[PDB]
Amino acid sequence: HSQGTFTSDYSKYLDSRRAQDFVQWLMNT
């Protein structure tokens, strides 16, 4: 029982938060 394949720079590297904070511009409130 283990996840997080070795492939790619997986492990932490995983990033994907383009929006957040900016959402207050592309669609404020």
Short mmCIF file of N, CA and C in Angstrom, two decimals:
data_model
loop_
_atom_site.label_atom_id
_atom_site.label_comp_id
_atom_site.label_asym_id
_atom_site.label_seq_id
_atom_site.Cartn_x
_atom_site.Cartn_y
_atom_site.Cartn_z
N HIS A 1 0.84 -1.19 0.00
CA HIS A 1 0.00 0.00 0.00
C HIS A 1 0.88 1.25 0.00
N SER A 2 1.09 1.79 -1.19
CA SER A 2 1.91 2.98 -1.34
C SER A 2 1.53 3.71 -2.64
N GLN A 3 1.44 5.03 -2.53
CA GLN A 3 1.09 5.85 -3.67
C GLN A 3 2.16 6.92 -3.90
N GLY A 4 2.12 7.51 -5.09
CA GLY A 4 3.08 8.54 -5.45
C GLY A 4 4.21 7.96 -6.30
N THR A 5 3.84 7.42 -7.44
CA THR A 5 4.81 6.84 -8.35
C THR A 5 6.08 7.68 -8.39
N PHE A 6 7.16 7.05 -8.81
CA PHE A 6 8.45 7.73 -8.90
C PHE A 6 8.52 8.61 -10.15
N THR A 7 7.79 8.18 -11.18
CA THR A 7 7.77 8.91 -12.43
C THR A 7 7.70 10.42 -12.17
N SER A 8 8.21 11.18 -13.13
CA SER A 8 8.21 12.63 -13.01
C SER A 8 8.84 13.04 -11.68
N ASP A 9 8.74 14.33 -11.40
CA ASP A 9 9.30 14.87 -10.17
C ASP A 9 8.25 14.80 -9.06
N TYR A 10 7.35 13.84 -9.21
CA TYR A 10 6.29 13.65 -8.23
C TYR A 10 6.83 13.80 -6.80
N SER A 11 5.90 13.94 -5.87
CA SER A 11 6.26 14.09 -4.47
C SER A 11 6.53 15.56 -4.16
N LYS A 12 5.48 16.24 -3.73
CA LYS A 12 5.59 17.65 -3.40
C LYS A 12 5.49 18.49 -4.68
N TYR A 13 6.40 18.22 -5.60
CA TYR A 13 6.43 18.93 -6.86
C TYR A 13 5.01 19.20 -7.37
N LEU A 14 4.15 18.21 -7.19
CA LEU A 14 2.77 18.33 -7.62
C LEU A 14 2.26 19.73 -7.29
N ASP A 15 1.98 20.49 -8.34
CA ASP A 15 1.49 21.85 -8.17
C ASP A 15 0.47 22.15 -9.27
N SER A 16 -0.56 22.89 -8.89
CA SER A 16 -1.61 23.26 -9.83
C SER A 16 -2.65 24.14 -9.14
N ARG A 17 -2.33 25.42 -9.05
CA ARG A 17 -3.22 26.37 -8.41
C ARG A 17 -3.19 27.71 -9.16
N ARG A 18 -3.37 27.62 -10.47
CA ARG A 18 -3.36 28.80 -11.31
C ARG A 18 -4.27 29.88 -10.71
N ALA A 19 -5.53 29.51 -10.52
CA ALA A 19 -6.51 30.43 -9.96
C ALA A 19 -6.07 30.82 -8.55
N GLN A 20 -7.05 30.85 -7.65
CA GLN A 20 -6.78 31.20 -6.27
C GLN A 20 -6.21 32.61 -6.18
N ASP A 21 -6.94 33.48 -5.50
CA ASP A 21 -6.51 34.86 -5.33
C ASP A 21 -6.87 35.65 -6.59
N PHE A 22 -6.49 35.09 -7.73
CA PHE A 22 -6.76 35.73 -9.01
C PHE A 22 -8.24 35.61 -9.38
N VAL A 23 -8.89 34.64 -8.76
CA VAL A 23 -10.31 34.40 -9.01
C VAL A 23 -11.10 35.67 -8.66
N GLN A 24 -10.48 36.51 -7.85
CA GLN A 24 -11.11 37.75 -7.43
C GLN A 24 -10.99 38.80 -8.54
N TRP A 25 -10.57 38.34 -9.71
CA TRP A 25 -10.41 39.23 -10.85
C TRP A 25 -11.17 38.63 -12.03
N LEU A 26 -10.93 37.35 -12.26
CA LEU A 26 -11.59 36.65 -13.35
C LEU A 26 -13.07 36.47 -13.01
N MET A 27 -13.40 36.73 -11.75
CA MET A 27 -14.77 36.60 -11.29
C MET A 27 -14.89 36.98 -9.81
N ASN A 28 -14.67 38.26 -9.54
CA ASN A 28 -14.75 38.76 -8.18
C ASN A 28 -16.16 38.55 -7.65
N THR A 29 -16.23 37.99 -6.44
CA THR A 29 -17.51 37.73 -5.81
C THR A 29 -18.47 37.09 -6.80
#
